[PDB]
């Protein structure tokens, strides 16, 4: 955010500067299907992230199915 606008309020946007892109993915074989290892260790839901937001945490929800 600082390399683009020379400030930093822009850290909380999936399309506005809070999107950690280009994560490593590892496509492996599951029990029958072909899935991908989630690059963050849990899939944070929207209610879980809002409950972490009220309790003072900077959570990283992962775009399920991509990098």
């Amino acid at each position: 955010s600082f390399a683009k606008y020379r400030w930093c309020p822009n850290i909380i946007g999936p399309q506005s500067g809070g999107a950690v892109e280009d994560l490593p993915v590892h496509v492996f074989e599951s029990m029958g299907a072909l899935q991908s290892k989630i690059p963050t260790e849990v899939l944070i839901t929207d209610r879980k992230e809002f409950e972490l937001a009220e309790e003072g945490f900077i959570a990283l929800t992962m775009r399920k199915g991509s990098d």
Binding site: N10, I12, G13, P14, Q15, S16, G17, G18
Partner: protein, 135 residues
Amino acid sequence: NAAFFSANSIQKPKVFPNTKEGKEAETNYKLGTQLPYMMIINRLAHYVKVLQREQIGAWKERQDLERELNSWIKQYVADQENPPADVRSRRPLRAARIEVMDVEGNPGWYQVSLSVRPHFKYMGANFELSLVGRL
């Protein structure tokens, strides 16, 4: 072969009293129960949940919120009395009203009211035969 004829959900059409609005809202509440029409607004709960999830953190306005939805759903709206058979199903809605309001106290929270309206299919007639003799 086989066929379905009516995909009505288990909900009952509630009888509303015989006012001007009650005779209207009875036909309004009847469209909720029928379930092909839920599936053209369940998709208007799955698209719009996804589409307004990417936007969190942007630089928007209420006038910008009105526009990113009105210019979006009017590719699903064919406000037309008799469009062809492909325009009816690619664009299943017929008219859509979006009224974005505010929330006071905590400013920047938007109670918008997307009010879609579908097309109407073919179910039942009467065909009351007779003979005229001359005409």
